[PDB]
A paper describes a structure:
The structure of N-HGbRL was first solved in the open form in space group C2, with two subunits in the asymmetric unit. In the distal site, an imidazole molecule from the Ni2+-affinity chromatography binds to the haem and the highly conserved Tyr28(B10), which also coordinates a water molecule, W1. The distal site of N-HGbRL is lined by all hydrophobic residues (Phe27, Leu31, Phe42, Leu53, Val56, Val94 and Leu98) except for Tyr28(B10) and Lys52(E10). The A-ring propionate of the haem also hydrogen-bonds to the side chains of Arg80 and Tyr84, and the D-ring propionate to Lys43 N and the Tyr28-bound water W1. A ~ 25° bending of helix E results in a large shift of subunits B* between the two forms, creating a huge pocket of about 250 Å3 in the distal site of the open form that connects to several tunnels. The huge pocket of N-HGbRL’s open structure may be able to bind a comparatively large ligand. In the open form, interaction between subunits B* from two adjacent asymmetric units, Arg39(C5) from one asymmetric unit and Glu47 from the other, causes loop CE to shift relative to that of subunit A*. When comparing their highly conserved Gln(E7)–Leu(E15) regions, however, helix E of N-HGbRL’s open form is moved forwards by about a helical turn relative to that of HGbI, leading to a structural ‘frameshift’ of three residues. HGbI also has a smaller distal pocket which is connected to the solvent through several tunnels, but the distal pocket of the open form of N-HGbRL is readily accessible from the solvent through an opening. When a signalling ligand binds the haem in the closed form, it dislodges Lys52(E10) and pushes helix E outwards, inducing part of loop CE to fold into the extra turn of helix E of the open form.
Author numbering:
A (entry chain A): 1 to 136
B (entry chain B): 1 to 135
Write the structure that this text describes.
């Protein structure tokens, strides 16, 4: 997500934080109306329903911030690459060539599983870096 | 990824390091054979090719470890949910209900964009938690 997209989420969150008791009552009423079977799982103090819903929303937003922070190293790397003249379209050939090289060095003990893991790691990283390229 | 999968990555990585000079040479030779148009992007220094490929592989693996650590909070949360009696099948209805509540509360200021953002955030989180449930 973009810094502004995270900003939009945090604002909507602070909007609800104001009316937390109301939001809490609405959530559980709704959840137990549509899915009455999960009622017994919730052993919360009845006066804290608002607080407990707020804690869920808090958790999501705070964790979203932490993950965004964790992604910043990759965006940093991608910005240096923008400066090197690398473009989004160049990432596949590098990945294939990395994989080609590994498979050749690792030799006999190279597995389809290993190749899948290296591929997943590369594509996931390249996806975040590519997003950064498109911001430029 | 599981810890065991990350270790598999780490182990193959250490193997390449063992002959990093050769891996470097192989890599750049292949890249420029396959895609000569990108050759002008790279600084000319054949003797450093081992080091240069190593920076790349090191970055990938360490960053992979960093991201995996960043996911541990969601996984810890999910482990508590397992103890609470929660099942992977419960995640979609709770997500729908959470976003339904936000939409009702925010009222006229709600937008499709906001709804799509909360959806993306919830689904990405739930996907990590559900993976933990299935272990
Ligand atoms: C991404 C989704 C979810 C998030 C972020 C979330 C967050 C939280 C948080 C922060 C708590 C407070 C206790 C703790 O930290 O362990 C909690 C408790 C709880 N949640 Fe969730 N939750 C999620 C999904 C679900 C789902 C799908 C269910 C299914 C019914 C559920 C049921 C419960 C129950 C039963 C408790 C404990 C209530 C009690 O204290 O008795 N949660 N959740
Ligand atoms: C996920 C994929 C990639 C990773 C992890 C990666 C990693 C790195 C690292 C760690 C460096 C050292 C300098 C620095 O840290 O900024 C570097 C440099 C560099 N990379 Fe990448 N890179 C990736 C993709 C690419 C692609 C697609 C290209 C396209 C041609 C490329 C071309 C370059 C160039 C030209 C340099 C400057 C060093 C030199 O001139 O040899 N990289 N890369």
């Amino acid at each position: 997500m973009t810094r502004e997209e995270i900003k939009m989420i945090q604002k909507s969150w602070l909007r609800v934080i104001d009316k937390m008791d109301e939001a809490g009552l609405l959530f559980y009423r709704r959840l137990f109306d549509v899915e009455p079977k999960v009622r017994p799982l919730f052993k919360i103090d009845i006066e804290k329903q608002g607080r407990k819903l707020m804690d869920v929303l808090n958790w999501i937003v705070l964790n979203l911030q932490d993950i965004d922070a964790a992604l910043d190293a990759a965006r940093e790397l991608a910005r240096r690459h923008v400066k090197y003249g690398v473009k989004a379209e160049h990432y596949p050939v590098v990945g294939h060539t990395l994989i080609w090289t590994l498979r050749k060095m690792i030799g006999s003990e190279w597995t389809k599983q290993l190749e899948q893991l290296w591929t997943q790691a590369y594509e996931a990283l390249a996806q975040v870096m590519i997003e950064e390229h498109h911001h430029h």
